[PDB]
Amino acid sequence: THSHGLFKKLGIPGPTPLPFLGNILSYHKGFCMFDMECHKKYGKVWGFYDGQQPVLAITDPDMIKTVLVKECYSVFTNRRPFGPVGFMKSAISIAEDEEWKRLRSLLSPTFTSGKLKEMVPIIAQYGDVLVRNLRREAETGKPVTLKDVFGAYSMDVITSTSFGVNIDSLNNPQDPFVENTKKLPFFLSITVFPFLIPILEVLNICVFPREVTNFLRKSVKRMKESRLVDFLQLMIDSQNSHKALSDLELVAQSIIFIFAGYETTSSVLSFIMYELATHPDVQQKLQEEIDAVLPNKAPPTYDTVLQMEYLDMVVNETLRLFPIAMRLERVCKKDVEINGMFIPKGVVVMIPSYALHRDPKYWTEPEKFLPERFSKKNKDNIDPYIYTPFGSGPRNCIGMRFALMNMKLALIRVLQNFSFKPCKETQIPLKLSLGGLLQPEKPVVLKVESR
Ligand code: HEM
Ligand SMILES: CC(C)(C)OC(=O)N[C@H](CN[C@H](Cc1ccccc1)C(=O)NCc1cccnc1)Cc1ccccc1
């Protein structure tokens, strides 16, 4: 401090920072709107200050491939530290440098195409629970709240795919497991006072409600010492060139997988049905493709799901409009030059996916939901360093292939059985949380009718 001079020195444009806040007052309309403005105001690069912390935004595809891929192990290894985390410092999304490189290795074979193929029968069963739970609301010509029935499904898939537990969390009861995973303004006060993190690190306040973490540390070792197909097993099978996964490190990845697979898989299926509700020709065209591949509502399989090319298109286009990570970020750990531009040590480099996904300069009619931009005809003209819903490089979304599968096995089973109609209480056009998450302002609600 006052570091507020640093992009004025390097000759890089940007909104002027108020002392101690940087430009965080500019986050009132949301991260996403701030980015699209600074994109149009300033060009290919710009910078702003979260409190005292310099963030340099980059939009050049080569410069992005340099950062995410070429210069990753060397310069851009870690993301921006947030806290207090406590024992979750050992989670993979959060660890740094060699403790991350190690965790990546030990957890990479779990996410293989081969491992995921053996998960398909387990992920199939809870699509059925999803249909009956949906039917009891479809036979009752009353509108349905999507994040609930999709959250109950998203939840049903995680506990089973990561620990073996088997519930119908929607109805089936206060089963000992549904409630600690329930408790999945403070995170703004970190940005002006990041010097208060180590304060909170010595005070063992956990952003993870300390209790939940106490429930699963013991619940993991209950399962650990009972058995002695799922994530906890493929992890336990690994700890039998790197020191092996400890017992609290394993609990912490189990947690990272529960966070990951829950409100992401749930919120995306929301955004996709909304798109499918308010665009009923795409709904029918997909319903057709599903019935040609799986006649008579034939149960989907691994291979049949990678077969549906329109299903992939609807998914990708929905994610282009709703890249639920909004931004990608890496901390620059050395003085470096990349594609002819100096970036000093400590800067946080940021890629505004949601800006790029909705940039007219690459996307014709970007606000329109148009799945044909991913036709095998047109899918080739898409710069993979513009469309980046799962990141890129060695730090990208490790769960990429599984989420895509899990979400697609949800849609197939549901669009075989129901058609989805707008209700008078549907928010149209849907509006994004002015807040800090990519979710709908008003929850997505729609009419469900049985085919
Ligand atoms: C629609 C679903 C999902 C989307 C869009 C998504 C997206 C992302 C993105 C953008 C990143 C950051 C990539 C980067 O930093 O360049 C990420 C990281 C990560 N994701 Fe996903 N994710 C999804 C679901 C999941 C699921 C189901 C898991 C299951 C375990 C998962 C596990 C992770 C982990 C562990 C990381 C941190 C990677 C690391 O630090 O090495 N994600 N995800
Ligand atoms: C803005 C601040 C700093 C306050 O929120 C974050 O801490 N960040 C987000 C979520 N963090 C979680 C871990 C987490 C989340 C909330 C509370 C406590 C612990 C993560 O790592 N979940 C794996 C996962 C997530 C989403 C897609 N796929 C996999 C978003 C994010 C983006 C990219 C990678 C990781 C996380």
Swiss-Prot record:
Assigned GO CC terms: cytoplasm; endoplasmic reticulum membrane; intracellular membrane-bounded organelle
Post-translational modifications reported in the UniProt record: Polyubiquitinated in the presence of AMFR and UBE2G1 and also STUB1/CHIP and UBE2D1 (in vitro).
Regulation: Activated by cytochrome b5.
This enzyme's EC code(s): 1.14.14.1, 1.14.14.56, 1.14.14.73, 1.14.14.55
Effect seen on changing residue 318 to M: In allele CYP3A4*11; unstable form
Domain of life: Eukaryota
Subunit relationships: Interacts with PGRMC1; the interaction requires PGRMC1 homodimerization.
Summary of the function given for this chain in its UniProt record: A cytochrome P450 monooxygenase involved in the metabolism of sterols, steroid hormones, retinoids and fatty acids. Mechanistically, uses molecular oxygen inserting one oxygen atom into a substrate, and reducing the second into a water molecule, with two electrons provided by NADPH via cytochrome P450 reductase (NADPH--hemoprotein reductase). Catalyzes the hydroxylation of carbon-hydrogen bonds.
Protein's recorded name: Cytochrome P450 3A4
Organism, as annotated: Homo sapiens
